[PDB]
Amino acid sequence: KETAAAKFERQHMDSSTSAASSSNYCNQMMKSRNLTKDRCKPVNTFVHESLADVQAVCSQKNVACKNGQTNCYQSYSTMSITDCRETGSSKYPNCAYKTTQANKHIIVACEGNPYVPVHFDASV
Protein backbone atom coordinates (compact mmCIF):
# COMPACT_ATOMS: atom_id res chain seq x y z
CA LYS A 1 0.00 0.00 0.00
CA GLU A 2 1.10 3.56 -0.79
CA THR A 3 1.71 5.50 2.42
CA ALA A 4 0.77 9.17 2.78
CA ALA A 5 4.46 10.07 2.72
CA ALA A 6 4.96 8.07 -0.48
CA LYS A 7 1.93 9.75 -2.06
CA PHE A 8 3.41 13.17 -1.26
CA GLU A 9 6.66 12.17 -2.97
CA ARG A 10 4.74 10.97 -6.06
CA GLN A 11 2.50 14.04 -6.24
CA HIS A 12 5.01 16.70 -5.27
CA MET A 13 8.68 15.73 -5.54
CA ASP A 14 10.70 16.17 -8.71
CA SER A 15 14.30 16.49 -7.58
CA SER A 16 15.58 15.31 -11.00
CA THR A 17 15.42 18.74 -12.67
CA SER A 18 16.63 22.10 -11.36
CA ALA A 19 13.66 24.01 -12.75
CA ALA A 20 14.04 23.74 -16.53
CA SER A 21 10.42 22.57 -16.83
CA SER A 22 9.49 23.09 -20.46
CA SER A 23 6.06 24.43 -21.46
CA ASN A 24 4.92 20.80 -21.70
CA TYR A 25 6.35 19.74 -18.30
CA CYS A 26 2.99 19.79 -16.53
CA ASN A 27 1.13 18.00 -19.34
CA GLN A 28 3.72 15.22 -19.11
CA MET A 29 4.27 15.11 -15.35
CA MET A 30 0.62 15.28 -14.27
CA LYS A 31 0.04 12.25 -16.50
CA SER A 32 3.13 10.24 -15.53
CA ARG A 33 2.65 10.82 -11.79
CA ASN A 34 -0.91 9.54 -12.25
CA LEU A 35 -2.74 12.74 -11.32
CA THR A 36 -4.97 12.60 -14.42
CA LYS A 37 -6.34 9.10 -13.83
CA ASP A 38 -9.86 9.64 -12.47
CA ARG A 39 -9.99 13.35 -13.28
CA CYS A 40 -7.76 16.26 -14.22
CA LYS A 41 -6.37 17.26 -10.83
CA PRO A 42 -6.95 21.02 -11.13
CA VAL A 43 -3.80 22.30 -9.30
CA ASN A 44 -0.53 20.59 -8.30
CA THR A 45 2.99 21.73 -7.36
CA PHE A 46 6.26 19.90 -7.96
CA VAL A 47 9.26 20.68 -5.77
CA HIS A 48 12.71 20.59 -7.40
CA GLU A 49 14.83 20.24 -4.27
CA SER A 50 16.34 17.19 -2.60
CA LEU A 51 13.99 14.97 -0.61
CA ALA A 52 16.11 15.69 2.46
CA ASP A 53 15.67 19.46 2.05
CA VAL A 54 11.90 19.09 1.66
CA GLN A 55 11.63 16.64 4.57
CA ALA A 56 13.64 19.12 6.68
CA VAL A 57 10.82 21.67 6.29
CA CYS A 58 8.84 19.67 8.90
CA SER A 59 11.18 21.09 11.55
CA GLN A 60 11.21 24.65 10.19
CA LYS A 61 8.67 27.50 10.60
CA ASN A 62 5.39 26.24 12.09
CA VAL A 63 2.39 28.02 10.49
CA ALA A 64 -1.39 27.47 10.29
CA CYS A 65 -2.62 25.21 7.48
CA LYS A 66 -5.24 26.59 5.10
CA ASN A 67 -7.74 24.18 6.68
CA GLY A 68 -7.08 25.51 10.18
CA GLN A 69 -4.96 22.59 11.39
CA THR A 70 -1.69 23.53 13.10
CA ASN A 71 0.69 20.99 11.56
CA CYS A 72 1.96 23.06 8.62
CA TYR A 73 5.53 24.28 8.11
CA GLN A 74 6.98 26.95 5.89
CA SER A 75 10.49 26.63 4.42
CA TYR A 76 13.05 29.14 5.72
CA SER A 77 14.52 29.39 2.23
CA THR A 78 12.85 29.76 -1.14
CA MET A 79 12.68 26.56 -3.18
CA SER A 80 12.56 25.84 -6.89
CA ILE A 81 9.00 24.72 -7.74
CA THR A 82 6.70 24.29 -10.70
CA ASP A 83 2.99 24.98 -10.38
CA CYS A 84 0.63 23.06 -12.67
CA ARG A 85 -2.79 24.57 -13.29
CA GLU A 86 -5.45 23.02 -15.50
CA THR A 87 -6.19 25.14 -18.59
CA GLY A 88 -9.71 26.39 -19.25
CA SER A 89 -9.97 24.35 -22.44
CA SER A 90 -8.75 21.18 -20.73
CA LYS A 91 -11.05 18.19 -21.16
CA TYR A 92 -10.61 14.84 -19.38
CA PRO A 93 -9.05 12.47 -20.30
CA ASN A 94 -6.86 14.89 -22.30
CA CYS A 95 -5.90 16.97 -19.29
CA ALA A 96 -4.04 20.17 -20.19
CA TYR A 97 -1.96 22.35 -17.88
CA LYS A 98 -0.16 25.68 -17.71
CA THR A 99 3.41 25.17 -16.45
CA THR A 100 4.78 27.92 -14.18
CA GLN A 101 8.26 27.79 -12.63
CA ALA A 102 8.97 29.88 -9.53
CA ASN A 103 11.20 30.27 -6.49
CA LYS A 104 9.12 30.53 -3.36
CA HIS A 105 8.81 29.29 0.19
CA ILE A 106 6.75 26.12 0.39
CA ILE A 107 4.24 25.24 3.09
CA VAL A 108 3.65 21.52 3.75
CA ALA A 109 1.57 19.58 6.30
CA CYS A 110 3.60 17.02 8.24
CA GLU A 111 2.48 13.91 10.10
CA GLY A 112 3.72 10.64 11.53
CA ASN A 113 6.81 9.07 13.06
CA PRO A 114 9.08 9.88 11.38
CA TYR A 115 7.52 13.33 10.97
CA VAL A 116 7.44 13.94 7.23
CA PRO A 117 5.45 15.90 4.67
CA VAL A 118 2.06 14.45 3.74
CA HIS A 119 0.35 17.37 1.96
CA PHE A 120 1.39 20.40 -0.07
CA ASP A 121 -0.55 23.34 1.39
CA ALA A 122 0.75 26.44 -0.41
CA SER A 123 3.68 28.43 -1.73
CA VAL A 124 4.36 31.99 -0.62
Ligand SMILES: Cc1cn(Cc2cn([C@@H]3O[C@@H](CO)[C@H](O)[C@H]3O)nn2)c(=O)[nH]c1=O
Ligand atom coordinates in the same frame (compact mmCIF):
# COMPACT_ATOMS: atom_id res chain seq x y z
C1 LIG B 1 -2.69 25.58 -3.29
C2 LIG B 1 -2.00 24.36 -3.76
C3 LIG B 1 -2.63 23.14 -3.77
N1 LIG B 1 -1.94 22.02 -4.19
C4 LIG B 1 -2.69 20.78 -4.21
C5 LIG B 1 -2.42 19.47 -3.41
C6 LIG B 1 -2.92 19.13 -2.14
N2 LIG B 1 -2.42 17.84 -1.88
C7 LIG B 1 -2.73 17.13 -0.69
O1 LIG B 1 -2.48 15.75 -0.78
C8 LIG B 1 -3.69 15.07 -1.26
C9 LIG B 1 -4.09 13.99 -0.28
O2 LIG B 1 -5.49 14.06 0.01
C10 LIG B 1 -4.72 16.19 -1.47
O3 LIG B 1 -4.82 16.60 -2.83
C11 LIG B 1 -4.22 17.29 -0.53
O4 LIG B 1 -4.57 17.00 0.82
N3 LIG B 1 -1.76 17.41 -2.89
N4 LIG B 1 -1.72 18.34 -3.82
C12 LIG B 1 -0.70 22.13 -4.65
O5 LIG B 1 -0.10 21.17 -5.03
N5 LIG B 1 -0.08 23.33 -4.65
C13 LIG B 1 -0.70 24.44 -4.22
O6 LIG B 1 -0.05 25.65 -4.23
